[model samples]
Target: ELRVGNRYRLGRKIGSGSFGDIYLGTDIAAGEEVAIKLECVKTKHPQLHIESKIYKMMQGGVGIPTIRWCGAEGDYNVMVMELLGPSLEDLFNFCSRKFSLKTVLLLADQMISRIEYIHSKNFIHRDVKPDNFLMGLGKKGNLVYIIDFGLAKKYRDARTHQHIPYRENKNLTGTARYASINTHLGIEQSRRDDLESLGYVLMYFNLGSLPWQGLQKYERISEKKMSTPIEVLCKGYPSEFATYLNFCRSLRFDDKPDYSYLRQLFRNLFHRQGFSYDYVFDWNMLK
Candidate 1:
């Protein structure tokens, strides 16, 4: 184990990010658990530096992590952040891939709000998936937090408040299963793309598997996405899921999404279902 900044002790390897390995670490001064991410200084295309910058910019927003430290050591750029619990991917696997409607609704509100806030900061999370959303620790355990900003991009000029121009012929940059149809077409991604990806993730939680899974090629997956109707894809589930996907798909590349409308849709559905919005997710009952 190595000591970082003379205040944190690196522990066992916990996971790996796009550019580096993540280690379980301890904030020796504060006596708290932290996640340490390390990337080689010599790597041509580094992700941690930009990720740390976006994390700082997006700080103080709900569902955002507190980045404790980010700096370069001998040959590695190290980043330490608040250690969160298992990701939604881990939780989804624990529940046999099927999540109840109530659990999905609970997640829907938070996920939408998280992306809304990220967009508020002029950035779009190019990668939105279960693996990028994690549950908080202890008292905040019921809350969901978004992580991994390696693929995040600024979609607007900070001072000018001007939206990024729409473009095409761009390569896909997110998880294939949850990527928006526009991404498959080599279209530049924007805020709508994140919401669309979130829609697929929500549906996956409710339905266990998407219709396009088990495919080997991108075009094949995109083919199914284009052909599948909302009604057919969301069969057996609430109409709200279908509605969300439709709205996202129809949005223009530079359109500012009506995030409040989307959140309200699920919130109203939660009420209609007689759920308390109590934050009791599927994994909680497994304990």
Candidate 2:
């Protein structure tokens, strides 16, 4: 246990994961609350270095958390970031086990906008999931922030790049259900994979479950195991969501939809009901 400045009195641990422990702390110097992440020995230094680089690059960009400071102290590496509001995962749980269509569309629109901005910078967030999205504080209302860049990477020459085989020796590095089929097949990922994952995340928010969850359960029932496409998985979705599911499922490394088209689609569906800060903070306080 390392102690920082007298100003920041670390409180109870709020979260713990493979990277480290997240503490609820008070920043006496700034007289504000903040989350402090303390990295354990098993945390990969290279990943942290890459995350630090991404944060530095994303500064001033909308929907990204502002990094207060990062440095090594004794046996731990510490990063101070803006304490975020409730996570989308928590919100999903709060919404009575299902997300209303309106909420799903709202979240998808904001997330896609942020994705567009990130893609414009030639970066790919290989890991896109509901848990990674953070709601903002107070009633300026529903603004969201994309947090965590542990699996983020830059894509070079995406427009004309050919598919590359995945190296069998390398460990897979993304969430299983949200990963694109190409990722499952051990192919090098691109913007399309990111979008595909985003689509799954959106569908998850809308339906409160993943396509694979059903498949896995079905396999257990029939003693048959298989991976299936979105079309097969989305058999019972409302008609309005079918097109979006098809688009997400049909995505390929060479045939990614342009961000502009995606932007237009989301805009047409969700409109411009900005985020509610009140809802987010209220949700956070409940936790």
Candidate 3:
């Protein structure tokens, strides 16, 4: 519905959030399809500058979108990036709200790789949920791209490169359902927190829901989030999930997580279950 910089044409709004609408756009000069995020002036989202810097910083990493153009033009602050396919949430629903073991293993590997890359860049993706992670299209369809850096921020001090102190009474910065316990407790988030959120995400994909799903009130939901032990939550799923949850919980507020150990845990599960770490997702089986 809007034209950005005379070259990109925003056709229609494909998606929207608190920040703004995401348009499936086109670069007329280059004949390329792109996604344009027009951000709002007052919203709980990152500034266009920070988002662009994170994307630029992730240039050589796998599963990262390449930004074609970004700036504030006219009434909206815009971000023009690679156009991706349906979000993981769409695919999860399409697959009857459950993922096969094969799908989980394949997804976990790539996701861990991308998450690892993000930590290396010093930003903690405060919002770690399925909707923020999307699948690629065509040749890159098997790869998963992490999107929406609006809630992301640096966890370590830039000058010293040392971990920051944990503080209390912090506002929640991510989805309530998948948020880590530390987030629920009003504690500052870190790399471990991101990994913990992903742990819950993996559990959700396999089980189709979490204990906090049906709760309506925020206080009650958070109360249950704190009450339910990781072991109790991981019940009925594979033992690896419980182990993963325990490992995530064992991390100190300022501890650096062992990404390799976590990845290998899932790898071991894949090995034991006879699942290949291939691109054979559940959608492929459906077709």
Candidate 4:
């Protein structure tokens, strides 16, 4: 059956997008296991109430995803949260799609410390992908959770705190095979364009493919993502993913993203590929 914020009760239907459908709930008074996410958005129901106020400004801030209760359930705008697992595009199609620079440096140092705590709470996911990064089953299976924020925003300007102006030709937003060459030069996306769209999602999780993959044409995948060249998409990978896509293609859309120098440049590529930060992800097949 379905029950919304009457203390959680929807069940089954585990996921869908564009703000709707994702059931499998059970927090009937903290018995645990939740993940609702319904959505009506009838003229934008307060944009899911500002995404639960960015999950309560990322409460407790570590690999996010806790907001276990949001409102509206008639015309539907529910939320509920927590339950997570099986992404990074369903573990890169169950390990067949590729991912081993020691599982993309153990998921790129926890998604660059979870996008540096979602840009230290100024907000900027701007749709990073690999199905919005997930993993964490029983006992939080080697954690890594950064889910959707509906193209998260606010690259600064909450009542003129500043850092906003940069608007020139803007239509294409994320998921264009892991967007960001300044979102294919449509401009205006910050935090070095969300770490250059997580350096093209760690080179499409270690070359499963992307030189603007399978382009039918968004003007030829925005002309091969603005005429390719992060050393031709990190040729044969590593070289710290071409110095992490040349420090996110040399930032400067309103700077401020040292982010512990891109988390020690994946801790110096796990100290020159000897590898062992030991979170042991990649679905922990850990042999």
Candidate 5:
């Protein structure tokens, strides 16, 4: 079989998180390079099965990495998939500062399109952070692809499964900073939470800061006080983007903004250099 330097012959360690390690491996049988994820079998959780199911169901969907092969090997579960480029985290650090507004907006649009596709399939990506996004292969045009669906879940489609009502639980599964307040309050997540997290990610990318940058002081001073990141954002960001963040912060359980409305907002923020505060409208004000 294939061997790199007489070891597993792994070329490079591409990614690693709380779950496991991913490497670029030379596959002898396949006669090509492939990505290999080695997950500890003992530490494997239900999310692994959920992610596997999602990858299987979403084979040809855009902005998702494709799986080539998957199964167990040795003490670890080995997943072979197409090699992906650097993650958004890497790109952000590589840029050495915040990305251009145009780049941020384009990334946001692509992420929303991908999430819409996932929602169309009745899946909710519980985790949507920069670390979970990857750049696409050659000629993908700065495409942003969603990866690491370990926390994803499939809700029964009411149109098809009609008998089940929405359920709320306290098990929050995502990056804390990007999590919606409803999520912190033990409400069942939905497409709305995904969009909310996406908004936070976009703001972080544009501003070069995390949403909880100074939450400790804010919590000590007044739990109701705005977070440092949010305070800075309010003072400095464009009104359109500030309005978008406000809407994201205001969402409650079971509330979802119209996607068309969000699409138009981003359009204006990116296309017009001098959008006015009049363009900023609360969610209820829209209609």
Candidate 6:
């Protein structure tokens, strides 16, 4: 029974994030449904404010959510933005946790494009996971949007193009199941880390599981990731998958990734498999 920004009224809780709870909100002025993320003023770590600022800065770009209004209420930091549909994880479960090569390739194309745009803006989405990517609503349903900027950080100087200095002994910043090897080793994350995580995601979609899944220990999971060769991880799939993971792993902290090459890599495979860019996902077939 809380309201913020004078017009947006809170509803049922829809989702939860690292430091906030998202609700089904309403824009009373226009009768539009929106997602309002609320974090307590007394929370040890404040992230909703920072996330709102990042969303505002990255607005108008592909896959970036549009921020409507953000400010503080009596005891909470409130952010209202465009409401998105089920996340990739939701659809993944709906599809029985399995995605075909065509579906995975189609997703990879858009996912890479979104990440490239974020990197171009001089920011790195440290946490790249299926739960963070959601499908749009209504006419934009097929379009996938990236969310959860609570952990995002600038990887370079916007004006000078100077990259962040690399250092070790850092904590991991992403989901353990899909993180890059460097991330597990406590290396500072950069653009390369994002793409590397994407590779694991794509593979997980196609394979339905990863070798390191169900492990309770982070070090054990990291060891499994390092021990499994790219050739084995991408086995039975097209050579482009292995090529993609290899390309991502080869990058240095300051290296600029060849986003086009990575996109085209899957595009070529998509065409090779005789799949067209129809934008029809596996869940779409159910309808």
Displacement of the residue 213 alpha carbon in candidate 6, Å: 0.2
Tens digits of per-residue lDDT, candidate 1, 64-108, equal 999989999888888999898998999899999999999999999
Q: Put down candidate 3 lDDT per residue, 82-135, tens digits, no spaces.
A: 899998999999999999877987888888888889988888888888988898
Among all windows of ten consecutive residues in candidate 1, which has the lowest summed lDDT? Answer: 13-22
Off by over 4 Å in 5: 1-11, 40-49, 158-169, 214-232, 249-252, 255-257, 274-287
Using all chains and alpha carbons, the TM-scores for the candidates as numbered come to: 0.96, 0.79, 0.93, 0.35, 0.79, 0.96
Give the alpha-carbon lDDT of every model.
Answer: 0.90, 0.67, 0.84, 0.78, 0.68, 0.90
Q: In terms of TM-score, which candidate is stronger, 1 or 4?
A: 1
**Candidate 4 — which pairs collide?**
none
**lDDT of residue 38 for candidate 3:** 75
Instruction: Estimate the lDDT of model 4.
Output: 0.78
Model 5 lDDT on a 0 to 1 scale = 0.68
Stretches of candidate 3 above 4 Å error?
Answer: 40-46
**Residue pairs clashing, model 2:** 138-277, 139-278, 141-275, 141-276, 141-277, 142-275, 142-276, 142-277
Poorest 10 consecutive residues of model 5 by lDDT? 277-286
Tens digits of lDDT, candidate 4, 1-287: 76774677877887765455577888778888787877675764457768778877777787788786677767777778788887788778778888778888878888988998888677787888887777877777788888778768878866666877889799877667677766767888888888877888888888888877775467788787778877887787667787877877787888887878777877777888787676776656734
Of 4 and 5, which scores higher on TM-score? 5
| Model 5 C-alpha lDDT per residue in residues 100-174, reported as the tens digit of each score | 666676677777788888877777888888988887766763566888777777755637743224567666678
* Candidate 6 clashing pairs, residues 3+ apart or interchain: none
